[PDB]
Symmetry: D2
Subunit: 466 residues, 4 copies
Amino acid sequence: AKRIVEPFRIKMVEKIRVPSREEREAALKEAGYNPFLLPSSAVYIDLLTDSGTNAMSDHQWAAMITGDEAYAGSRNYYDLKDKAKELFNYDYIIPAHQGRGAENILFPVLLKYKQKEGKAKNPVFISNFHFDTTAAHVELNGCKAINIVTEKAFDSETYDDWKGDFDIKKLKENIAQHGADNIVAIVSTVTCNSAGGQPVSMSNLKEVYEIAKQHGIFVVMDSARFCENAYFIKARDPKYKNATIKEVIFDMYKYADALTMSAKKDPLLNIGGLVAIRDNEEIFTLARQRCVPMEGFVTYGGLAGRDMAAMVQGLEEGTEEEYLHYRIGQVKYLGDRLREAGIPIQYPTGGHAVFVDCKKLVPQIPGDQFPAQAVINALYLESGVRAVEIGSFLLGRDPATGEQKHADMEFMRLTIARRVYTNDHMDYIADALIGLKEKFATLKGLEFEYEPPVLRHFTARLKPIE
Amino acid sequence: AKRIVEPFRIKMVEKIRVPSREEREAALKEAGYNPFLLPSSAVYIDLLTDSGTNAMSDHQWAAMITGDEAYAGSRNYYDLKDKAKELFNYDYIIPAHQGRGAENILFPVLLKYKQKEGKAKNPVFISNFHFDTTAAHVELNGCKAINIVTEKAFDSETYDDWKGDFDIKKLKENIAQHGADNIVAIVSTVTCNSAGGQPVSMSNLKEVYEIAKQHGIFVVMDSARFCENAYFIKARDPKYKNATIKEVIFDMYKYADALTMSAKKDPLLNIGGLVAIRDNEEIFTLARQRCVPMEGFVTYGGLAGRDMAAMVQGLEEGTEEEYLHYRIGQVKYLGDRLREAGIPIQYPTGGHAVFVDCKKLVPQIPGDQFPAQAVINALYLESGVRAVEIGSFLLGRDPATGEQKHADMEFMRLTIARRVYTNDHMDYIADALIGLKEKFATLKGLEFEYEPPVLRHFTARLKPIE
Amino acid sequence: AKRIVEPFRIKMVEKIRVPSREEREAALKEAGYNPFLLPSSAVYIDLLTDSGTNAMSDHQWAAMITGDEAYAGSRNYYDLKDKAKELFNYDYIIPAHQGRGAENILFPVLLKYKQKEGKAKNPVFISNFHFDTTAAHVELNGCKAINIVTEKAFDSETYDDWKGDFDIKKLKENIAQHGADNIVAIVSTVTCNSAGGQPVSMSNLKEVYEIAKQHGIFVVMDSARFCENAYFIKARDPKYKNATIKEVIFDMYKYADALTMSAKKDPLLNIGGLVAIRDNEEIFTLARQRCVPMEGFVTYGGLAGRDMAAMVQGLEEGTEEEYLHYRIGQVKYLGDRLREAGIPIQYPTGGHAVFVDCKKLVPQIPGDQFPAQAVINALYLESGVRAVEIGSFLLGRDPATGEQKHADMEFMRLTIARRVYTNDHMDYIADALIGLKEKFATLKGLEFEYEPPVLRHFTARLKPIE
Amino acid sequence: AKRIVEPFRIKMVEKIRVPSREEREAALKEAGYNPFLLPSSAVYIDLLTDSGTNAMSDHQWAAMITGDEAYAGSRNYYDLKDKAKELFNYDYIIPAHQGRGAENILFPVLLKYKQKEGKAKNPVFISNFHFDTTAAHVELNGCKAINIVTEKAFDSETYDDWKGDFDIKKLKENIAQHGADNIVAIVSTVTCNSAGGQPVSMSNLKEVYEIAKQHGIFVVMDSARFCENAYFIKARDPKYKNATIKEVIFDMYKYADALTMSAKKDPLLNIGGLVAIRDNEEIFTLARQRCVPMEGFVTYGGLAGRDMAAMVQGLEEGTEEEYLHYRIGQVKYLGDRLREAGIPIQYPTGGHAVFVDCKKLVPQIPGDQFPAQAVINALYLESGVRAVEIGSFLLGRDPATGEQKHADMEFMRLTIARRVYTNDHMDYIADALIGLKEKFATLKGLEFEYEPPVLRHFTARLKPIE
Ligand SMILES: CC1=C(O)/C(=C\N=C(/C[C@@]2(O)C(=O)Nc3ccccc32)C(=O)O)C(COP(=O)(O)O)=CN1
Ligand SMILES: CC1=C(O)/C(=C\N=C(/C[C@@]2(O)C(=O)Nc3ccccc32)C(=O)O)C(COP(=O)(O)O)=CN1
Ligand SMILES: CC1=C(O)/C(=C\N=C(/C[C@@]2(O)C(=O)Nc3ccccc32)C(=O)O)C(COP(=O)(O)O)=CN1
Ligand SMILES: CC1=C(O)/C(=C\N=C(/C[C@@]2(O)C(=O)Nc3ccccc32)C(=O)O)C(COP(=O)(O)O)=CN1
Ligand SMILES: [K+]
Ligand SMILES: [K+]
Ligand SMILES: [K+]
Ligand SMILES: [K+]
């Protein structure tokens, strides 16, 4: 395992503490064995998400201080519009308060646009993988969320350069089965969070856009982690070995028509989202009409002006190759430390997190009893580290069936916030999980005490099966 | 006209400038003669809204700096929960990214809950007045937005203590005509923004709640400007003459079952909203379930932790009577200067803005030609001051009939942000509008070039009728 | 009295509070009848000084948080160096923690340089007027501080354009009485703080520099309030009517060899000082060697990097004419309010304060009993406003005689911080002093209880004479 | 080598870059071969000092935002006075702008206080080791700075618990040779910066103070790194095995009569100093009288109010044992890395820096040619890391004879700012120095091209002896 040095130094700190063992068992029982319902004071190292937990730079905080809080026509809206034209070559922007606000603006608009000519009678969205809020909005509007990631992603131990690729054969077959008139949009998620933060090659993005253009289908790039995807393209595609990250990004977005971005990820923010549209003014105008009731006025979209200002600076900082090398290198370090102790992970590691394969760690727990969540409650009670489940729990139920959606992967996600923790924090995380090696076969399983009908893993209360 | 000194001193300033005459004219031509589409660099003193443009305290900024950005269980969430129990005596909270986000959480939940037993086939909301995003969410869910403000609000120059009161006769008549089973909720807006920021009395709120309780109708307090309402109750109600502001607030919220609040108004913020529920845990649970896909996890709701921290501090400062006396006194000063120079305004002034009655200022322009937007565009080209219209433009159209909603009031709103402008800024505003007295009769209305189907006045472009 | 509108708006506030009469009488008795020993919590509007109490912009705060805290070679040091070459055309800078730190760097070095040549056997400094720490440092190094302001500054109610001017006749007479070999340096104080913040004309600056260069006499421009001086030269000298503020400043500093600046005044800071030398690399090197033991390393000189960062931005903002017009106009507004009620002041008012002539207000109290302090303790006890004395109390004793220095002016200084208070605060201040007209003839002098031998007026405790 | 994890996480970052070898060589040549004259833009990792380069907490920044900037009686001044009563049991404080500002306040006052009644005719100060600026102020006031560190500090490789102790025998010898009447004060530097940041035992401080009280000698605690001293006492003295850090600090300061503190070190600040006095109100009053002309008014002392607020919070954080364990453990980690590779260091490592024994590393260079400054310049050209010399160069010359002061030590100080660099930065520094093994013997010393007479090493320009 190779440690990489920060291409920065620390300017401001916040204290963390280790709760006692007795505090963690009391708090986890009060939280219904769902770590989402734990207070942050009961958590030591928080690995629940990399969304909104990143450490900003001094330049970002300065941008916030001079941010323009005007209600209409803020100076930072025009800055954000210029930055999107620079990075993606897109001509239209609509800020949003975060990623699921961006999707709530754009996806209902695309569905109504597809219905203008009586089409979308049985509407579907096709993605390499819809993450949980993305699929939830697809389903909220009466559509089906179809995931066609390459089957290589389901083989954890088997290395592959692009475990986030669309299955091209499945794309053409889904287009054939449903019909181009039923596919409201194709959503390319970069990186593929559900596959393990695994990247999509430039050729896969290029071929998906060509097949979608052949059939007149709209393509949306889910751009939460597009810089980490761009970094992997430069690292693994020989064509881009000598290109800059901004050149990789600029070629990526030639293969989409619009983007929904959670700026709480690669732009290194605590809050923020973005819609951008390449050149379709009619879809832009319709998306603006929905932004107003749902998010806010079209030049702030539910964000304070200081946050747009921080987004303009974060969009720049998130593309710096030397930061990307350290960030993804750090995730790789935690992964190599866990692999060297024989703990199975999605190999190679992605950009933002290490995903532990809990199918292999605890095969006595059937997927419907959430094996990964068993390892999570175990890791927390042992160490004070809080992680999240990316498996049957998060996947929830089929809105049409009512039964469990089939899980091909049962991951425990060690999500790493950007510029927040050091490799010494990583050593605590790795050593903590490694210490449970003689206790995995003892882990039990979980059953619902209260289950929400949508996005159940966020607030469901669980009961141990013992 | 009585000037009231600031109960604070300035700690940080932000530069503003007067753009030239030819810059403003080109800008308004560029903005489709809609001030909303102007850039802030074309605006000198910005009176477009009191929402999100407030100036925070050093204590608020300090609270942001120690804000807890944790994804789940933020320390500042529990502070906000405690704060809402202190102010309102309400047991459950859900943060939202702003007011319309909070309405999107609760209003669809109340509609579904009311229909749980096959009832509410013709669902309606009843309010003294729904503001535009409030009525928009009522109508986006397929309900009718009924407004029954007191007739005394329609008599601008005639003083009345409570121009935001419900029409108790129209309330009982509407419960009879529609049936309690079709009334999803009664929404008490404090202060009544549409009537001119005019207050609702305690006994009016008390009687509406008791009427609703008799028929089992859920009551929501739209609480954007609830402190300004509490101040007026203390000033004008002899029952609360010797009571604290917080004692008045505690009583107000005995006459509701929940609130939706835009924290960008009286809590002195640049972003933020809040849902609070008194004691119905079932409504709270369903509202949580809708918060996750639309806004964020239930302990931040689309806000950074720093913004929840500011809200806890802002909720305290906004109740300070010394600040409230100065704030509402600054609004009263601006209106008195105009009223003394013969300019018709909603008398008495509201808490957050002076409302110039343009029907009596420009009688030549019919209501359907938006008489107040003529006065606003005239004021802007003259002084670099940008105002907003509250009349037929903002009312929009009846969604079922598709035609202009009848406007009883044609206001130009000079909206004053909290703790941002001095009384010398107020003198600049007043002198500008006074200098246009010889040109009012020459102004003409404006027709539509581009009209959105919902919330038109935000992005619509206008053609001045020559 | 004419109110001038702020060329900015408020971005952050700080709460102020009126202490009860009981709190003020107890506090002033506890403070030894010296308001300097009062706590800030016992003060309402603080008019003690305009030094270090100014409100910064959002740009200054933004500069601070990206400030470079490096011990040596901070990026902001070079920004500060370039700024002084832009503004003053000076080629060397040495930061200092504030004004008296800058004098301590340069004045002892000026004395040693003159002595290295066998001169300064009976050394003296000559100024239009040394302020108290300036005069104290000259005296601390064994020199006499001679003040030769124009006698027109002693006729307070008689208008004059340049009540800070040197007396060219006294300058020539002192050069002949002492000899150029005894004059260590001439210090030009702009604006002349002791004369009432009154300006020095360009031609007066030009004549003094030419007289000194004739005799090989080093000229230091004491520059705490150089921007306010530049404003008065543009306002009152026909040669500079169409010049910019920076063109006026650039000419001002052709008439000095160096400057000592308290940046806590016109550069709008809460801390900070500056030494800048025109082209004498020898004086620079000697001053660097004294900076190290007394202030810090030569590239920060007792300032954090963030404060040097705020100085680069504040230096620019301090020169802006629209700001200088409002600030100086606010001082005049307070003066005209007091004048219109018959209160005698140094007329015209200076750039940073209104100086109430207590020699004309309480003639029953002899100057040796500090009549201005009598008016001050009375104003504070009546209203919570804290002012400061500028007369025999501040003048102190002559080091040679040990007796009271002859005072030609007894002033109560109502010192106004920049961008902190509004004209409504000015109204409260004026109304408070006006309310004392009947009690002036009954006020009583003060006697020393404890008297420091240097700068007594800061920490001395006084007894009201019975 | 044992890595200790941070008891905090990163909240804000500042970018750092590695300059090209081309830039570095030009930068050092431009800087007269003195790294002090390097711009920070030519430095990668800056180990020049731990003074004022630390990283503050979010609580410290929040304290700055609400700092009270009042000129007299700032709320933060009283919080500081209370904090010093809490920590040290001292009744009087005077804030100072940094460490040498505190020395300039107190050392002249101690000299004049001792010279009452015509004694102290040959004044001396005695310390375990006066640091450079401390000895400079002793000598600037015409005194001798006698340094009597224990002989065990001169054996770098041989471990000792208390290498900063006073040589008690030499203290008694110097009291007899000079007489108790000529000793102005004994200065107890904790930790002993010159000995390598090495601690002073509690029994050493006790016996020094008791000996001083027998002779009526005043004792000043130089307190820049007093928390790091307090940690070592608890780590190494069995009597304080179960004591809190605050109990150790409270005991340490029973053995002084006053302190001079550079709050730029253990209080975790970027600027700030402090004088505190146990109970001598006469010294307090005399020291205040000097504070006013030299630093500023007594309640701020050349600091902004925000900086006093940060000091109140830093004085608490700097005592936290869990932070001290990490901080000193990190310095120890860098030392072990060097020691394991054969690099001679002062063993054991002290609190704030690794001191490399260059008397053993480059034996071919004599002390007159500054061997450590050749290793420093070589390390900078090799890697971009900037360190500082603590040997013959910093030692300077004897004021009485004018020749090089005899140096027992030739240290290259790798100085570690607090909470700024991760252990992966420590690895970079380590490998960079280890890679210079085959070049040490090849280096040669330096000679003066420009030498200042006071504190020469800050601004001297050197020439490499070829
Ligand atoms: C690819 C994509 C996302 O990964 C994505 C957000 N992912 C998150 C944040 C999140 O709350 C979530 O949504 N699900 C989930 C599951 C477990 C923990 C935390 C979370 C994440 O931690 O992986 C969004 C939504 O953006 P948004 O949060 O700004 O509204 C859209 N697209
Ligand atoms: C009583 C109530 C509100 O007054 C209210 C908001 N009022 C606003 C903000 C607003 O954008 C708007 O909505 N319409 C409108 C019309 C003209 C200018 C600006 C605006 C206002 O300035 O008048 C909300 C929604 O809150 P939200 O903005 O945080 O989402 C809910 N209830
Ligand atoms: C022309 C000039 C100055 O006016 C000046 C400072 N003036 C001050 C600040 C001051 O503390 C003071 O010194 N005396 C005094 C008397 C009453 C109240 C407050 C004060 C002021 O309020 O007028 C300096 C010193 O600079 P410094 O404060 O940064 O050290 C040098 N030159
Ligand atoms: C024990 C003690 C100190 O160590 C101490 C300061 N030490 C510093 C800062 C310093 O500039 C220095 O003075 N010499 C020196 C030598 C090399 C690099 C940097 C420096 C340090 O990095 O070691 C002070 C003075 O305090 P001050 O800096 O706030 O004025 C007093 N006592
Ligand atoms: K967050
Ligand atoms: K805003
Ligand atoms: K200050
Ligand atoms: K610093």
